[PDB]
Structure 1
């Protein structure tokens, strides 16, 4: 039952955001001015502790339409999160805590958004993650998980394919606790939606299996908005979209125009806004005491009280079910089981050749029993990626009869970009969820919006990217990565492992799974690769190490993945013509660059020509070698030995090229490429 204070709360949210943008002299005022009533009605009714933004059973809210940040920054300040008027008075400025689009790093901001389509897709991970937790640990008497995931979205997020991929899957899985509120404002940047987007959203979403409710006066009807949220909460086995119509820039002297989407309202427009809302035209960043006190009784103090009850029931649970309690307690502290690493496989050069892909499968076989928080899947490639262990149970709705929500194998369908973002949402949930998803390395490029954000936020998701080159063969150039790794190695904060054998696969799994702030790509072979004499988890964990040494070498050859063996063989050949060649295995650029310089310079020393061997683009290699043998053109369709042969990657093709490199440089002094001037 909304009184005049609820109407005072809504004008302070709108004008605070107006103020924020106008001081910054930059930012988007329009959606904050129209979404403010929905923010007030929703937040007031979400169960959350502002003093503990990390309580696992907190309701989660994602602002998918990240450009509306000043609405999230006002709410965060007013409902009592650590963020202040001074923070806000520095919206969009160098160094401040208030950047131009929300970032995971701030408290009460759940994932970073700004790229459209990302927030709504992350929220689907969050709801899958709650569905899984609740299923795993809730016991009759102890309902430790039952929260909701509220999403805010625009027309933009409904146009991007990722949210149609995500929504299709959310609908399949029956994710009842996911509630999206669509700001139907009939405007985006170029103008009116009818110029390019006139589909029937509601019918589109009901087709997916979502329930759709409507609110027609979202600009003033707090009860309407209120009853929709409440009806949505009864939708136990359908996600809900609430389509709430609003006017962009409500109150503004140019509301409904598209000029109010991303520029500060002008001075005189803001003053009439203050007068009309009963605020003073010449005062800014003003919060009535009545608003703090309101949210203090409405949210902060029940939230703390709710958080506090949770703690006591969790402790009776650790008494009642000591080992499940022990498990959840660990995940919540964010440590992995002690000494889990002992279940990782090791091999010698005595055991068989095996594609790095079937070795990948053996890690998953050996570790899932040890790490309950490891939840995996595939974007329809399960038998190609070898990404599901034998005793698994699929994550499905219980009605399906194929699996249930305790299951740990997500079937993603042909939805890469969606799986990238759903993986980020499962990881941003907490309780130590280790998400992975497989596909073919060539199609991880589809997911690139989502993967740049696993890197910007630091979400340790794992991509199991199999079929990593022309050794795919006959599927041809549409399915053969050329530029893929080079790309992702130019992206700050992401591990790109390309293992050469069994020990190096175990080191890629170990470092990826132990990571707390870097995502990983494990690039894996379709084809059989031999076990190497002298690979080791320990050594490959440094990301780059001398695999085969000689005294006073003529050349250093550096290879990644399937080219390490080819380089060892070319190394025998160079030896018989009396050339000493050192073979270096660089499984991950990132991890090796995290090494201390004096390590790096023992692996890639001065005064020795250094040549790289890798069947993908040579563009990222100048930082480790002097001359590079790689492929800077698309591949080809044929038997895989023949495509390798057709491009030169043969032991005598590498040896020839090492010889031409020794010859080119005899007499010159050579500096290591690692060394920089400044």
Structure 2
């Protein structure tokens, strides 16, 4: 039952968003105006604490149509979050807390959106995390977890393939606490949706197993919107999509036109809009006191009290369940178990040779019990990635018969992109969730859109990327990575691990799991590799180190993964020719670059030629080596050993190129590629 104060709040939201966009003379007024009614109704019935944006059991909201951020900033301010009118007055300005698209860093913003399709996919992950948390910690009389996951999205998100992947999986998973509101306004940047998007959205979502509800007049029907949301909560066995029809830019002289999608409304348009809603056309950023009072009473105080009651319930829970209570308390503090790394496998040169793919499997087997927050999965490559521990229980709806929500292994299906965004959502949920997902390194590229946000937002997600090179063999070039590592090494804030042996694999996992703000891609091989003499978790955790040292080397061979052992063998060939080669292992560029310059230079000093060895593109190696031996063309379908030889990657081949490099620089003064002039 909504009254005049509710209508006033809606007008306030609409005008505040418009003023925000107008002052910036940049931004999108359309969707904010169209979705204001829904924002008011939804937020007014959400259980959250504006004074504690991190409350674990808060209902969560995701703006998948991120360009409509002026609406989110308006809601954040109006409902009590730490965002002021001045912040809104700095919308889209260098260094403000109000960037042109929602950023994870801001309190109240659950994830970074802007790239269409990501938000809704993130929400699927949030709902999955909630389901697991509840199934793992809830007890009779102690409902610690039961929040809802709300999402706003438009035609753009519905067209991006990632949302189809995520929605198909969400339907299979029967995520009944996931509720999405679709802004059905029939407009996109190119004009009417009919010119490129006339599918039956409702029918498609029902096909995924979603319940689809409708709100014919999303422009004014507050009760209808409220009723749809209420109904969505009743279908606990199906995620729900609410097709809410609205007029983009409602209120504007050009409402319903693509022109109001992403350009500020003209001054006179804003004036008539305000007058129309009973506001002074000559005033801006106006918030009637009655509106603040209303939200204080309907959202803020009730939210603070809900959080209060929850803290009381959790306090008692820890007394009732000391172990589970301490476990969750630890997770909420964002810390892994003390000395958890002690369970990471260690090796010596005496141990047998193992593929890093298998070594990875062993690490997972040795730490999954120690890390209850660890949630794994694979994009339909479980037997190939070796990402599922022996007695794992799959994350599935109870009715499946293949597992339940307390399960910790996700069957993502052939959906890399959605897996990437879902992991971001699981990570964003909190409670120290540590999601990891497996697939072939070459197909991690299918999820670049999501991986980029993992890096930008700082979601510590982990990609277990096996079959890292031509070592794949027979499957051929369409399956053999060449540009993949160079790509992500060029992406800020992402670890790109390529472990050479057992100890390096443990270091990769150690650093990846302890990471709080940096995602990780761990590139693994399927071919067997020997346990290197000189490797250790401690040294490899530095991203780069001297594996095999020698006094006054004639050359330094810097390599990664499978090529480190190759370089060690090449060193033997060189030694047989009275040539000294120091071998450097560079497990991770990112981690290495984080070390002090002093250390990095001790690894890659001046006065000695440095040649890199890695069976992938050489484009990214200029930062560490003078010359590079790699592959800058596509692969080949053939037995792995034969393919390596085809490309010249044999001990002799490396040694020969080392000799050429030595002769090439004889008599020259060499400077470490690490030294910069500014």
Q: Calculate the TM-score normalised by the size of structure 1.
A: 1.00
The alpha-carbon deviation at position 490 of structure 1 amounts to: 0.2
The alpha-carbon deviation at position 674 of structure 1 amounts to: 0.2
Measure the CA separation in 1 of the matches of 2:287 and 2:672: 60
Cα root mean square deviation, aligned: 0.4
Which residue of the partner structure matches residue 656 of structure 1?
A: 656
Which residue of the partner structure matches residue 283 of structure 2?
A: 283
Measure the CA separation in 2 of the matches of 1:534 and 1:391: 34
Confirm or deny that 1:641 pairs with 2:641: yes
The alpha-carbon deviation at position 307 of structure 1 amounts to: 0.3
Measure the CA separation in 2 of the matches of 1:263 and 1:521: 38
Map Cα deviations across residues 257-310 of structure 1 (whole Å, 9 max, x no partner). 110000000000000001010000100001000000000000000100000000
The alpha-carbon deviation at position 534 of structure 1 amounts to: 1.0
Map Cα deviations across residues 225-281 of structure 1 (whole Å, 9 max, x no partner). 010000001011000000000000001000001100000000000000010100001
Measure the CA separation in 2 of the matches of 1:575 and 1:391: 48
Which residue of the partner structure matches residue 266 of structure 2?
A: 266
Measure the CA separation in 1 of the matches of 2:312 and 2:86: 37
The alpha-carbon deviation at position 437 of structure 1 amounts to: 0.2
Map Cα deviations across residues 8-40 of structure 1 (whole Å, 9 max, x no partner). 000000000000000000000000000000000
Measure the CA separation in 2 of the matches of 1:399 and 1:254: 49
Q: Secondary structure at the match of 2:677?
A: coil
The alpha-carbon deviation at position 174 of structure 1 amounts to: 0.3
Measure the CA separation in 2 of the matches of 1:265 and 1:555: 64
Measure the CA separation in 1 of the matches of 2:503 and 2:148: 42
Map Cα deviations across residues 148-192 of structure 1 (whole Å, 9 max, x no partner). 000000000000000000000000000000000000000000000
Q: How does 1:504-523 map to 2 (within 5 A)?
A: 504-523=504-523
Measure the CA separation in 2 of the matches of 1:287 and 1:200: 40
The alpha-carbon deviation at position 395 of structure 1 amounts to: 0.3
Map Cα deviations across residues 624-643 of structure 1 (whole Å, 9 max, x no partner). 00000000000000000000
Q: How does 1:329-340 map to 2 (within 5 A)?
A: 329-340=329-340
Measure the CA separation in 1 of the matches of 2:480 and 2:576: 34
Which residue of the partner structure matches residue 252 of structure 1?
A: 252
Map Cα deviations across residues 186-229 of structure 1 (whole Å, 9 max, x no partner). 00000000000000000000000000000000000100001000
The alpha-carbon deviation at position 459 of structure 1 amounts to: 0.1
Gaps of 5+ in 1: none
Which residue of the partner structure matches residue 447 of structure 2?
A: 447
Map Cα deviations across residues 447-484 of structure 1 (whole Å, 9 max, x no partner). 00000000000000000000000000000000000000
Which residue of the partner structure matches residue 220 of structure 1?
A: 220
Map Cα deviations across residues 340-382 of structure 1 (whole Å, 9 max, x no partner). 0100000111111110000000000000010000000000000
Q: Secondary structure at the match of 2:77?
A: helix
Map Cα deviations across residues 605-634 of structure 1 (whole Å, 9 max, x no partner). 001000000000000000000000000000
Measure the CA separation in 2 of the matches of 1:215 and 1:262: 25
Which residue of the partner structure matches residue 112 of structure 2?
A: 112
Measure the CA separation in 2 of the matches of 1:144 and 1:237: 20
The alpha-carbon deviation at position 124 of structure 1 amounts to: 0.4
The alpha-carbon deviation at position 441 of structure 1 amounts to: 0.0
Q: Secondary structure at the match of 1:254?
A: coil
Q: Secondary structure at the match of 1:584?
A: strand
Measure the CA separation in 2 of the matches of 1:175 and 1:213: 16
Measure the CA separation in 2 of the matches of 1:88 and 1:589: 39
Map Cα deviations across residues 496-530 of structure 1 (whole Å, 9 max, x no partner). 00000000000000000000000000000011011
Measure the CA separation in 2 of the matches of 1:604 and 1:135: 50
Gaps of 5+ in 2: none
Measure the CA separation in 1 of the matches of 2:43 and 2:314: 25
Map Cα deviations across residues 584-613 of structure 1 (whole Å, 9 max, x no partner). 000000000000001000000001000000
Measure the CA separation in 2 of the matches of 1:143 and 1:333: 20
Measure the CA separation in 1 of the matches of 2:573 and 2:34: 72
Measure the CA separation in 2 of the matches of 1:382 and 1:24: 49
Measure the CA separation in 2 of the matches of 1:367 and 1:641: 33
Q: Secondary structure at the match of 1:464?
A: strand
Measure the CA separation in 2 of the matches of 1:48 and 1:190: 37
Measure the CA separation in 2 of the matches of 1:321 and 1:598: 49
Measure the CA separation in 2 of the matches of 1:232 and 1:551: 71
Which residue of the partner structure matches residue 187 of structure 2?
A: 187
Map Cα deviations across residues 46-80 of structure 1 (whole Å, 9 max, x no partner). 00010000000000000000000000000000000
Measure the CA separation in 1 of the matches of 2:528 and 2:472: 11
Measure the CA separation in 2 of the matches of 1:198 and 1:276: 33
Map Cα deviations across residues 123-162 of structure 1 (whole Å, 9 max, x no partner). 0000000000000000000000000000000000000000
Q: Secondary structure at the match of 2:643?
A: helix
The alpha-carbon deviation at position 662 of structure 1 amounts to: 0.4
Q: Secondary structure at the match of 1:354?
A: coil
Measure the CA separation in 2 of the matches of 1:569 and 1:231: 67
Q: Which runs of 4+ in 1 moved over 4 A?
A: none
Q: Secondary structure at the match of 1:150?
A: strand
Measure the CA separation in 2 of the matches of 1:404 and 1:388: 16
Map Cα deviations across residues 633-654 of structure 1 (whole Å, 9 max, x no partner). 0000000000000000010000
Measure the CA separation in 2 of the matches of 1:280 and 1:366: 66
Q: Secondary structure at the match of 2:611?
A: strand
The alpha-carbon deviation at position 402 of structure 1 amounts to: 1.0
Measure the CA separation in 1 of the matches of 2:388 and 2:641: 28
Map Cα deviations across residues 379-435 of structure 1 (whole Å, 9 max, x no partner). 000000000000100000011111000000000000000000000000000000000
Measure the CA separation in 2 of the matches of 1:525 and 1:566: 14
Q: Calculate the TM-score normalised by the size of structure 2.
A: 1.00
Measure the CA separation in 2 of the matches of 1:513 and 1:378: 18
